[PDB]
Each structure stands twice: as structure tokens, then as C-alpha cells.
Amino acid sequence: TDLADKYASGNSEISGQELRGLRDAIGDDASPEDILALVQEKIKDPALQSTALDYLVQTTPPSQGKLKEALIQARNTHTEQFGRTAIGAKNILFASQEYADQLNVSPSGLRSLYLEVTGDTHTCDQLLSMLQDRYTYQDMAIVSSFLMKGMATELKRQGPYVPSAQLQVLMTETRNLQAVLTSYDYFESRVPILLDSLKAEGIQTPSDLNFVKVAESYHKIINDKFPTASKVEREVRNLIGDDVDSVTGVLNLFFSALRQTSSRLFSSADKRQQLGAMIANALDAVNINNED
């Protein structure tokens, strides 16, 4: 097996064939411009192109000093062209493919998502919002794992197109996202039960009330720089209305969620307890203020 197979091995998006096909397509007198043209023809994905170019520069012996210098110049040019779009996406090729498979989505889409995520600072919230409309919560968890994997990958690669500092922050934020998704899943299973049980006894809950709204409300509470029991109850009442059993249900649910929520999502363990205390206090307030 040659470099092309090394490149193609485990790489669900490049075959050793197309790489060899590319190297074979590039003549010894290929100008840097010629090289890029060919690479571009066979490979639309800048990541895969850059991959191809690496392959090409690398599969080219120094005997072909002019070609390699051309390929080097081509790749230098391609890299100059795409910078991170090529190099960053290239850096996380395998990751994108792994998770594309699990998600049954396109790896390139994931790399695009990834470059998107890594092309700028992104907070957890921004990541969640960036992902929610794109993925089921189940899949967001998977995507988050992907993002993490890709950034980890790039930080290890370094290079003038790895915004190393930036990726670090992004990974922090993506870990936060994962924590959030787990929390959302918590709510996914329990909210319906709560609402159905309320319903069974003729307690009407907002029909559009679902775990996400519940979870969202839950995470506003814990992300609140200045949460209170009143804010919590209010958050819950805003969420499910005022039926004592409903509010109690949700607060109970939030209370239970708190124990389950990742420490990442709290500035400290103290903050979690503080929130739990707030929720417990909310629960008390509900029953206290209950009349039925």
C-alpha cells in the first residue's frame, strides 16, 4: 500500500484511487496552477483538496525537484487560498467522517459545521442554537462529540491555521453544550410523564409545553448570574402555568434535574446547591401559596 492508501485508509471521503488518479494526472512540468486545477477537478472539498495536495507534495520525490517545488508552490498557494478552510477541515477529516456515520449525515457538512464552530469564538449557547435546528437532541449530543473531537485534533496538529487559543475556548464551550444536551435529555423523558399525569387528572398543562421549553427554562435558571427561588418559580410558572400540581411537578422536575446537571454548567458545586435551594424554596412557595 502506498501513500494514497495511507491517505485513503479510514478516510471515507478519499479513495487511494482518486489520489493516485490525481498524482497521475499531474505531470512533471505541472505549474503550481496546473496542480490546483487538477486537485480542484477531482476533489471539491478544500479539506480533501489540501489532503490531496499534501499527498501530492509528499508522494513526489525530490528527484522531481521542479514538480515538487511546483506542488509545494501549488499547495502553498492552495493553503494560501483556503487557509483554515482547507487546513482546519483537513485537520478534522476523520472526526467528521466518524460522526457523519453515526449521525447518518455528510462528513463535509460536519466539517463545515466544525469550521463554522471553530471559525470564531462560540459559546455553548451559540453552539446549542447553532445545532438545535440542525439536529435532534439525540444527534446534537453526537455532533457535540464531533466538535470536541475535531478541535482536540486540531490543537494537537497546530499550525498557522489552527487558532489554537480559539479552539481551546470552543472545546470548553462545546463540553458545556454536551452538558446542556444531557440535561435536555433528562427533561425529555420526565416532562411528558409529568404532563400526562397532570392531564390524566384533568389538570390542563400548556399543550405546547415540552421538555425543551422545560429544559430551556431549567438552564436559564442555572445560567442565571443571579437566580432566585422566586425567579425559579416564576420561570416554572411561565413555563407550565399555575396549577399547583403542574408547577410543583416542574419544580420537582427541575429540582431532580439539578442533581443530574453537569458541574460544567455551574460556576461551582455551590452554585448547584444554591439553585437546588432556590428550587426547593420555590416548591415550598407553591404549596404554601396553594389554595386547593
Coordinates of C-alpha atoms in Angstrom, one line a residue:
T1 CA 0.0 0.0 0.0
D2 CA 1.2 3.5 -1.0
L3 CA 0.8 7.0 0.4
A4 CA -2.5 7.2 -1.4
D5 CA -3.8 4.2 0.5
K6 CA -2.4 5.6 3.8
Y7 CA -4.3 8.8 2.9
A8 CA -7.4 6.9 1.9
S9 CA -7.3 4.4 4.8
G10 CA -10.0 5.1 7.3
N11 CA -10.8 8.2 5.2
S12 CA -14.4 7.6 4.0
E13 CA -14.1 10.6 1.6
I14 CA -11.0 9.8 -0.4
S15 CA -10.0 6.7 -2.2
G16 CA -6.4 5.9 -2.8
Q17 CA -7.6 5.7 -6.4
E18 CA -8.7 9.3 -6.7
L19 CA -5.4 10.3 -5.1
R20 CA -3.3 8.2 -7.4
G21 CA -5.6 9.4 -10.1
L22 CA -4.7 13.0 -9.1
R23 CA -0.9 12.3 -8.8
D24 CA -1.0 10.6 -12.2
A25 CA -3.0 13.5 -13.6
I26 CA -0.3 15.9 -12.5
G27 CA 2.6 15.9 -15.0
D28 CA 6.2 16.6 -14.0
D29 CA 6.1 20.1 -15.6
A30 CA 2.8 20.9 -14.0
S31 CA 2.9 24.5 -12.9
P32 CA 1.5 25.2 -9.4
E33 CA -1.6 26.5 -11.1
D34 CA -2.0 23.2 -13.1
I35 CA -1.8 21.2 -10.0
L36 CA -4.5 23.1 -8.2
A37 CA -6.8 22.9 -11.2
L38 CA -6.5 19.1 -11.2
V39 CA -6.9 18.8 -7.5
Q40 CA -10.0 21.0 -7.7
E41 CA -11.5 19.0 -10.5
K42 CA -11.4 15.6 -8.7
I43 CA -11.9 17.0 -5.2
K44 CA -14.5 19.6 -4.4
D45 CA -13.8 19.6 -0.7
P46 CA -11.0 22.0 0.2
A47 CA -10.1 19.7 3.1
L48 CA -9.8 16.8 0.8
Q49 CA -8.0 19.0 -1.8
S50 CA -5.5 20.1 0.8
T51 CA -5.3 16.5 1.8
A52 CA -4.7 15.6 -1.8
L53 CA -2.0 18.3 -2.1
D54 CA -0.2 17.0 0.9
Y55 CA -0.4 13.7 -0.6
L56 CA 0.9 15.1 -3.9
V57 CA 3.8 17.1 -2.4
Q58 CA 4.6 14.2 -0.2
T59 CA 4.2 11.4 -2.8
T60 CA 6.5 13.4 -5.1
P61 CA 10.2 12.5 -4.8
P62 CA 12.9 15.3 -4.5
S63 CA 14.2 14.0 -7.8
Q64 CA 11.2 15.7 -9.4
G65 CA 12.6 18.9 -7.8
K66 CA 10.7 21.1 -10.1
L67 CA 7.4 19.3 -9.8
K68 CA 7.7 19.1 -6.0
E69 CA 8.6 22.8 -5.9
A70 CA 5.5 23.3 -8.1
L71 CA 3.4 21.0 -5.9
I72 CA 4.8 22.8 -2.9
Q73 CA 4.0 26.1 -4.5
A74 CA 0.6 24.7 -5.5
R75 CA -0.1 23.6 -2.0
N76 CA 1.4 26.8 -0.6
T77 CA -1.0 28.5 -3.0
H78 CA -4.0 26.3 -2.1
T79 CA -3.1 26.8 1.6
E80 CA -2.7 30.5 0.9
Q81 CA -6.1 30.4 -0.8
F82 CA -8.1 28.3 1.7
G83 CA -6.0 28.8 4.8
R84 CA -8.0 27.3 7.6
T85 CA -11.0 26.2 5.5
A86 CA -8.6 23.8 3.9
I87 CA -6.3 23.1 6.7
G88 CA -8.8 23.2 9.6
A89 CA -11.3 21.0 7.7
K90 CA -8.4 18.8 6.7
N91 CA -7.3 18.6 10.3
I92 CA -10.6 17.1 11.4
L93 CA -11.3 14.9 8.4
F94 CA -11.5 11.6 10.2
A95 CA -13.6 13.1 13.1
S96 CA -16.1 14.4 10.6
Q97 CA -16.4 11.1 8.9
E98 CA -16.8 9.1 12.2
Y99 CA -19.6 11.3 13.4
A100 CA -21.2 11.7 9.9
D101 CA -21.6 7.9 10.1
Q102 CA -23.2 7.9 13.5
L103 CA -25.4 10.8 12.5
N104 CA -26.0 9.4 9.1
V105 CA -25.1 12.8 7.7
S106 CA -22.3 14.1 5.4
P107 CA -18.8 14.4 6.9
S108 CA -18.2 17.6 4.9
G109 CA -21.4 19.0 6.4
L110 CA -19.9 18.2 9.8
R111 CA -16.5 19.8 8.8
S112 CA -18.4 22.8 7.6
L113 CA -20.2 22.8 10.9
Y114 CA -16.9 22.4 12.5
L115 CA -15.1 25.2 10.7
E116 CA -18.2 27.2 11.4
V117 CA -17.9 26.4 15.1
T118 CA -14.2 26.9 15.1
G119 CA -14.0 29.9 12.7
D120 CA -14.9 32.1 15.6
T121 CA -15.4 32.0 19.3
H122 CA -18.7 30.2 20.1
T123 CA -20.2 30.0 23.5
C124 CA -22.2 26.9 24.5
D125 CA -25.5 28.7 23.9
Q126 CA -24.4 29.7 20.4
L127 CA -23.4 26.1 19.8
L128 CA -26.7 24.8 21.0
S129 CA -28.6 27.4 19.0
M130 CA -26.3 26.7 16.0
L131 CA -27.2 23.0 16.4
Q132 CA -30.8 22.8 17.5
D133 CA -32.4 23.4 14.2
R134 CA -29.9 21.1 12.5
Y135 CA -30.1 18.1 14.8
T136 CA -32.4 16.3 17.1
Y137 CA -31.3 16.5 20.6
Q138 CA -30.0 12.9 20.3
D139 CA -28.0 14.0 17.3
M140 CA -26.8 17.2 18.9
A141 CA -25.1 15.1 21.5
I142 CA -23.4 13.3 18.7
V143 CA -22.5 16.5 16.9
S144 CA -21.0 17.9 20.1
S145 CA -18.8 14.9 20.5
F146 CA -17.7 15.5 16.9
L147 CA -16.9 19.1 17.5
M148 CA -14.9 18.2 20.5
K149 CA -13.1 15.5 18.6
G150 CA -12.2 17.9 15.8
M151 CA -10.9 20.6 17.9
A152 CA -8.9 18.3 20.1
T153 CA -7.5 17.0 16.8
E154 CA -6.5 20.5 15.6
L155 CA -4.9 21.6 18.8
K156 CA -2.6 18.5 18.6
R157 CA -1.9 19.5 14.9
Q158 CA -1.1 23.1 15.5
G159 CA -0.1 25.2 12.5
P160 CA -0.6 28.7 11.3
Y161 CA -4.3 27.8 10.5
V162 CA -5.1 26.3 13.8
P163 CA -6.5 29.1 16.0
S164 CA -5.1 27.1 19.0
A165 CA -6.3 29.6 21.6
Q166 CA -9.7 29.8 19.9
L167 CA -10.2 26.0 19.8
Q168 CA -9.5 25.7 23.4
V169 CA -12.2 28.1 24.3
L170 CA -14.5 26.4 21.8
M171 CA -13.9 23.0 23.3
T172 CA -14.8 24.4 26.7
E173 CA -18.0 25.8 25.2
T174 CA -18.7 22.5 23.4
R175 CA -18.3 20.5 26.6
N176 CA -20.8 22.9 28.1
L177 CA -23.1 22.1 25.2
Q178 CA -22.8 18.4 25.9
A179 CA -23.7 19.0 29.5
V180 CA -26.7 21.0 28.3
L181 CA -27.9 18.3 25.9
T182 CA -27.7 15.7 28.7
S183 CA -29.9 18.0 30.8
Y184 CA -32.3 18.3 27.9
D185 CA -32.5 14.6 27.7
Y186 CA -33.3 14.4 31.3
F187 CA -36.3 16.6 30.7
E188 CA -37.2 14.7 27.5
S189 CA -38.2 11.6 29.4
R190 CA -39.8 13.1 32.5
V191 CA -41.7 16.1 31.2
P192 CA -44.2 14.0 29.2
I193 CA -44.8 11.8 32.2
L194 CA -45.4 14.8 34.4
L195 CA -47.7 16.4 31.8
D196 CA -49.6 13.2 31.1
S197 CA -50.1 12.5 34.8
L198 CA -51.4 16.1 35.2
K199 CA -53.6 15.6 32.2
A200 CA -54.9 12.2 33.5
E201 CA -56.4 14.0 36.5
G202 CA -57.9 16.8 34.4
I203 CA -55.1 19.2 35.1
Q204 CA -54.5 21.0 31.8
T205 CA -51.0 22.0 31.0
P206 CA -50.0 24.1 28.0
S207 CA -50.3 21.7 25.2
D208 CA -47.1 23.0 23.6
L209 CA -45.2 22.6 26.8
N210 CA -42.5 20.1 26.1
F211 CA -39.2 19.0 27.5
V212 CA -37.2 21.6 25.6
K213 CA -39.1 24.5 26.9
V214 CA -38.9 22.9 30.3
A215 CA -35.2 22.2 29.9
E216 CA -34.6 25.7 28.5
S217 CA -36.3 27.2 31.5
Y218 CA -34.2 24.9 33.6
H219 CA -31.0 26.2 32.0
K220 CA -31.9 29.8 32.1
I221 CA -32.2 29.2 35.9
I222 CA -28.8 27.6 36.3
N223 CA -27.1 30.1 33.9
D224 CA -28.7 33.0 35.7
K225 CA -25.9 35.1 37.2
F226 CA -28.4 35.9 39.9
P227 CA -31.1 33.2 40.2
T228 CA -33.6 33.2 43.0
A229 CA -36.4 30.9 44.2
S230 CA -38.8 33.5 43.0
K231 CA -37.1 33.7 39.6
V232 CA -37.2 29.8 39.5
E233 CA -40.9 29.5 40.4
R234 CA -41.6 32.3 38.0
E235 CA -39.6 30.6 35.4
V236 CA -41.7 27.5 36.1
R237 CA -45.0 29.3 36.2
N238 CA -44.0 31.0 33.0
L239 CA -43.4 27.5 31.7
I240 CA -46.3 25.4 32.9
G241 CA -48.8 27.9 34.3
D242 CA -50.1 28.0 37.8
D243 CA -51.7 24.7 38.6
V244 CA -50.1 23.8 41.9
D245 CA -49.5 20.2 40.8
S246 CA -48.2 21.3 37.5
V247 CA -45.8 23.9 39.0
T248 CA -44.9 21.6 41.7
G249 CA -44.3 18.9 39.1
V250 CA -42.0 21.0 37.2
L251 CA -40.1 22.5 40.1
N252 CA -39.8 18.9 41.4
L253 CA -38.6 18.1 37.9
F254 CA -36.1 21.0 38.0
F255 CA -35.0 20.0 41.4
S256 CA -34.4 16.5 40.3
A257 CA -32.7 17.8 37.1
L258 CA -30.3 19.8 39.2
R259 CA -28.8 16.7 40.8
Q260 CA -28.4 15.4 37.2
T261 CA -26.9 18.5 35.6
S262 CA -23.3 18.6 34.7
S263 CA -21.0 20.5 37.0
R264 CA -19.7 22.3 33.9
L265 CA -22.9 24.2 33.8
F266 CA -22.4 25.6 37.3
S267 CA -19.6 28.0 38.1
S268 CA -19.2 25.8 41.1
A269 CA -20.8 23.0 43.1
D270 CA -22.0 25.7 45.5
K271 CA -24.0 27.3 42.6
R272 CA -25.8 24.0 42.1
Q273 CA -26.8 23.7 45.7
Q274 CA -27.8 27.4 45.7
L275 CA -30.1 26.6 42.7
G276 CA -31.4 23.5 44.4
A277 CA -32.1 25.5 47.5
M278 CA -33.9 28.1 45.3
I279 CA -36.0 25.3 43.6
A280 CA -36.8 23.7 46.9
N281 CA -37.8 27.1 48.2
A282 CA -39.9 27.6 45.0
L283 CA -41.6 24.2 45.7
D284 CA -42.4 25.3 49.2
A285 CA -43.7 28.6 47.9
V286 CA -46.1 26.8 45.5
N287 CA -47.6 24.6 48.2
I288 CA -47.7 27.5 50.7
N289 CA -49.5 29.7 48.1
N290 CA -51.7 26.8 47.0
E291 CA -55.4 27.1 47.9
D292 CA -56.9 23.8 46.7

